[PDB]
Amino acid sequence: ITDENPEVMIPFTNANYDSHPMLYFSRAEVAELQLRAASSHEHIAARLTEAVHTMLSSPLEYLPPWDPKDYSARWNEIFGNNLGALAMFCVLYPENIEARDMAKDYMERMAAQPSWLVKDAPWDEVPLAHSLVGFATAYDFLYNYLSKTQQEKFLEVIANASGYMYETSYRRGWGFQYLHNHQPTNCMALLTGSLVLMNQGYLQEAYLWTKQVLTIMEKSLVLLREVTDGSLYEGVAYGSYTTRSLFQYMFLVQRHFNINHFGHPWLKQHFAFMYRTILPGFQRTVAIADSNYNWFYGPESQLVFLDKFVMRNGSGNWLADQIRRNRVVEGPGTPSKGQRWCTLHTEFLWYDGSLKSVPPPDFGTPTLHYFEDWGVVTYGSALPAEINRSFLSFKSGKLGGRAIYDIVHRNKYKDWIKGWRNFNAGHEHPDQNSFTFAPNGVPFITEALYGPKYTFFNNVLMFSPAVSKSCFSPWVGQVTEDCSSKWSKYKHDLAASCQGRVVAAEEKNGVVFIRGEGVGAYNPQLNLKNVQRNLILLHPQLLLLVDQIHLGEESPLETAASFFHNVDVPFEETVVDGVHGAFIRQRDGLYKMYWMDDTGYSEKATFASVTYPRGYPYNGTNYVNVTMHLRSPITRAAYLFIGPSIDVQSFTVHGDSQQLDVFIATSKHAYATYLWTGEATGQSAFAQVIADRHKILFDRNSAIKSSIVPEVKDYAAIVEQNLQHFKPVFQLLEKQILSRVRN
Ligand SMILES: *[C@@H]1O[C@H](CO)[C@@H](O[C@@H]2O[C@H](CO)[C@@H](O[C@@H]3O[C@H](CO[C@H]4O[C@H](CO)[C@@H](O)[C@H](O)[C@@H]4O)[C@@H](O)[C@H](O[C@H]4O[C@H](CO)[C@@H](O)[C@H](O)[C@@H]4O)[C@@H]3O)[C@H](O)[C@H]2NC(C)=O)[C@H](O)[C@H]1NC(C)=O
Numbered sequence: 071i072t073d074e075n076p077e078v079m080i081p082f083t084n085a086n087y088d089s090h091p092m093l094y095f096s097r098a099e100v101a102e103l104q105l106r107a108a109s110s111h112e113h114i115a116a117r118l119t120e121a122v123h124t125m126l127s128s129p130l131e132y133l134p135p136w137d138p139k140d141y142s143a144r145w146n147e148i149f150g151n152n153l154g155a156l157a158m159f160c161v162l163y164p165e166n167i168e169a170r171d172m173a174k175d176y177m178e179r180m181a182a183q184p185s186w187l188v189k190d191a192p193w194d195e196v197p198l199a200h201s202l203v204g205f206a207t208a209y210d211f212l213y214n215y216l217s218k219t220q221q222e223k224f225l226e227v228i229a230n231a232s233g234y235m236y237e238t239s240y241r242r243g244w245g246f247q248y249l250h251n252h253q254p255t256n257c258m259a260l261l262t263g264s265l266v267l268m269n270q271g272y273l274q275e276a277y278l279w280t281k282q283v284l285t286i287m288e289k290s291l292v293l294l295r296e297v298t299d300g301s302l303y304e305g306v307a308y309g310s311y312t313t314r315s316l317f318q319y320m321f322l323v324q325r326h327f328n329i330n331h332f333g334h335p336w337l338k339q340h341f342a343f344m345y346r347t348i349l350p351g352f353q354r355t356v357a358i359a360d361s362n363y364n365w366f367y368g369p370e371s372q373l374v375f376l377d378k379f380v381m382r383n384g385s386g387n388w389l390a391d392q393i394r395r396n397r398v399v400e401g402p403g404t405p406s407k408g409q410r411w412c413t414l415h416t417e418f419l420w421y422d423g424s425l426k427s428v429p430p431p432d433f434g435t436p437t438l439h440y441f442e443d444w445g446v447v448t449y450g451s452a453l454p455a456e457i458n459r460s461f462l463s464f465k466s467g468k469l470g471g472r473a474i475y476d477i478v479h480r481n482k483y484k485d486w487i488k489g490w491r492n493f494n495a496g497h498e499h500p501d502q503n504s505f506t507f508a509p510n511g512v513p514f515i516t517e518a519l520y521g522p523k524y525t526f527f528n529n530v531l532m533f534s535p536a537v538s539k540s541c542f543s544p545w546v547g548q549v550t551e552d553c554s555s556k557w558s559k560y561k562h563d564l565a566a567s568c569q570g571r572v573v574a575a576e577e578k579n580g581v582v583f584i585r586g587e588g589v590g591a592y593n594p595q596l597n598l599k600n601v602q603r604n605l606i607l608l609h610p611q612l613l614l615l616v617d618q619i620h621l622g623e624e625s626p627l628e629t630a631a632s633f634f635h636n637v638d639v640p641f642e643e644t645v646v647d648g649v650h651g652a653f654i655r656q657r658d659g660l661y662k663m664y665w666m667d668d669t670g671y672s673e674k675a676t677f678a679s680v681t682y683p684r685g686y687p688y689n690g691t692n693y694v695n696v697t698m699h700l701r702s703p704i705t706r707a708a709y710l711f712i713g714p715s716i717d718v719q720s721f722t723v724h725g726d727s728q729q730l731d732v733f734i735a736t737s738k739h740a741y742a743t744y745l746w747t748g749e750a751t752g753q754s755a756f757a758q759v760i761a762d763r764h765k766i767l768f769d770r771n772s773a774i775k776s777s778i779v780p781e782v783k784d785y786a787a788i789v790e791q792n793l794q795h796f797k798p799v800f801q802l803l804e805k806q807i808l809s810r811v812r813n
Pocket residue numbers: 338339340341342343345381383384385428429430431432433
């Protein structure tokens with residue numbers, strides 16, 4: 071009935087006034103930490119050692135500027151992020167005087183700052199969060215090496231920054247936008263400063279701050295119980311941002327207040343979110359929504375956390391090892407200078423070496439996984455990068471994920487939630503019915519990364535004679551589209567109901583079939599009835615896609631445009647026997663696509679290489695823009711994606727009122743695929759594939775049923791009970807302090 075696991079290996083330690091360190095470990099545990107660094111955590115200690123040796127080799131490049139105009143001129147999370155790694159190094163290797171002196175210098179440069187806000191982001195506290203949590207961690211880690219002056223002066227800096235963060239929690243979106251990455255980030259910085267002040271006897275301020283952090287976070291964790299698939303609606307990259315602070319919260323609040331969250335249902339599914347979103351080769355992730363090529367923070371820290379405290383079977387350590395060993399050193403996917411060392415110290419503290427690295431049993435078997443809250447299907451994740459080991463992904467779901475969408479729309483948690491005002495979906499993309507395809511582990515159709523929220527920056531459709539007048543000429547896309555130059559009045563109403571849906575998803579005898587429905591992402595006034603997308607993976611190097619657009623009889627649409635992206639390589643035109651197509655050149659050969667509507671006509675595509683506006687952190691993207699005339703009421707188009715190993719020799723498509731047939735002959739096999747117009751819940755199948763001699767039926771079994779998840783019972787009481795846990799800790803500290811004044 072509860073989200074507690076009493077067996078978790080985090081002892082509730084009772085507080086001791088003016089004892090340091092205390093945050094993550096005590097002084098008596100340092101000796102074991104040093105033993106670990108030399109014996110069983112050597113591979114993590116070595117990452118810390120190389121980070122610090124890098125800083126020591128160029129100290130003036132890495133030290134925060136004394137000059138406040140230089141300190142605050144740029145996004146400056148690198149200061150606090152790198153300080154955490156440096157401070158942990160000084161704990162493990164106290165005999166390195168040069169590193170301890172650099173850490174003192176580093177902290178002095180930060181403590182001299184009049185402000186930890188970035189110059190032209192006055193209303194954004196995240197840079198203050200990074201500086202504060204790193205500074206306060208270093209303060210705790212290094213307390214006994216500091217002078218008395220530094221011990222006092224640095225404490226005042228922590229109190230000032232923490233007090234400012236507390237005051238802004240009542241005046242900013244992050245104080246009430248639950249499960250948005252800003253909220254655990256800013257909360258954790260406040261809690262860390264609060265624990266440092268609590269330990270030093272400043273109980274009046276630390277009580278207010280602690281009570282405020284727990285109230286916000288405990289509410290979000292109750293809401294998080296409804297996310298049944300372990301995912302986060304902001305994607306893998308921003309999700310790693312969230313979990314960096316969420317996992318710190320769960321650890322610290324248990325160690326210091328005995329608030330136990332380690333039986334949480336979302337937490338025990340979360341491994342799937344990092345195991346099933348990783349592409350062949352363990353370097354990249356599916357990169358849905360605002361994302362880089364993989365993760366923002368960690369994820370080795372979060373993975374060893376899951377193994378020590380949740381799974382206790384060695385597959386978290388195993389996945390962390392795969393990612394650690396395959397990380398890119400230069401070029402796309404390289405972790406940024408600002409984020410790359412941020413979680414090294416918690417990875418060191420949370421790694422349990424007694425759980426030997428053991429892969430999940432299905433490792434090496436291409437597996438289909440459906441995230442029923444996120445609305446994302448993936449296939450072939452976490453494979454070795456090999457010929458015929460392919461990745462496939464598809465997204466069609468509810469804005470915010472099912473839990474957030476349903477909470478808002480059925481008015482759940484009335485005491486806490488008053489609509490979308492309590493959630494923040496600004497990092498999502500107009501991307502429903504999008505897909506990606508990485509045959510042989512070579513990215514072919516990819517996501518375009520962090521960028522402007524334009525529909526055509528995702529692998530989806532736009533439609534041609536818009537009723538409204540937006541940007542994008544007469545083209546209209548999905549209802550979450552934003553020109554970010556003008557937001558329409560009351561269009562938020564239709565954006566607030568954006569919704570795709572995965573209708574079917576099954577793997578059967580090496581063939582994958584996925585159907586999605588995208589009507590719910592487009593304005594109802596275009597009288598679209600069905601925006602249907604069908605994926606059929608006939609072979610690891612042969613993917614067939616069929617779109618079916620059913621127009622209502624009123625609708626004014628005349629044309630559709632489908633977009634297909636590759637973020638790293640531009641597309642080149644091609645045509646064979648009147649079949650238009652595109653290809654990209656990769657080192658292992660050419661990857662090709664060909665298309666035609668079901669009358670046999672294929673139009674030549676338009677090609678574009680786009681940068682991104684100044685302020686986004688990645689170059690841009692390249693896409694094909696395939697247009698098709700909307701034939702009659704029902705229109706259907708087939709696209710075919712080929713890896714270099716396969717030689718397609720016929721590609722014919724013929725259909726009628728109820729059926730469409732796609733025939734594909736290669737030099738080694740023949741493939742037929744039959745799809746039917748209408749829905750198939752109850753009276754016939756979705757698709758039938760005839761490979762060489764095998765008959766493959768995708769019937770009502772592959773259908774995906776929808777569920778409401780029930781409101782957590784007694785949700786207000788859950789939060790209230792947990793808020794009682796920290797009061798006796800404050801009371802005991804007070805008694806210890808009074809005990810000492812008397813003596
Ligand atoms: C460490 O702990 C993590 C976290 O729980 C595990 O992660 C899971 O890994 C598996 C794949 O290895 C994921 O897939 C699921 O596996 C289940 C199998 O579990 C074991 O027990 C069954 C018997 O109950 C054995 O037959 C099997 O060999 C396994 O040893 C399946 O039951 C799941 O679904 C199956 O049934 C459904 C319904 O019929 C089908 O649709 C599926 O196709 C499948 O047949 C599923 O396959 C699982 O999702 C992972 N969980 C999470 C949360 O990520 C690690 O595997 C574990 N590592 C080690 C070393 O044990």
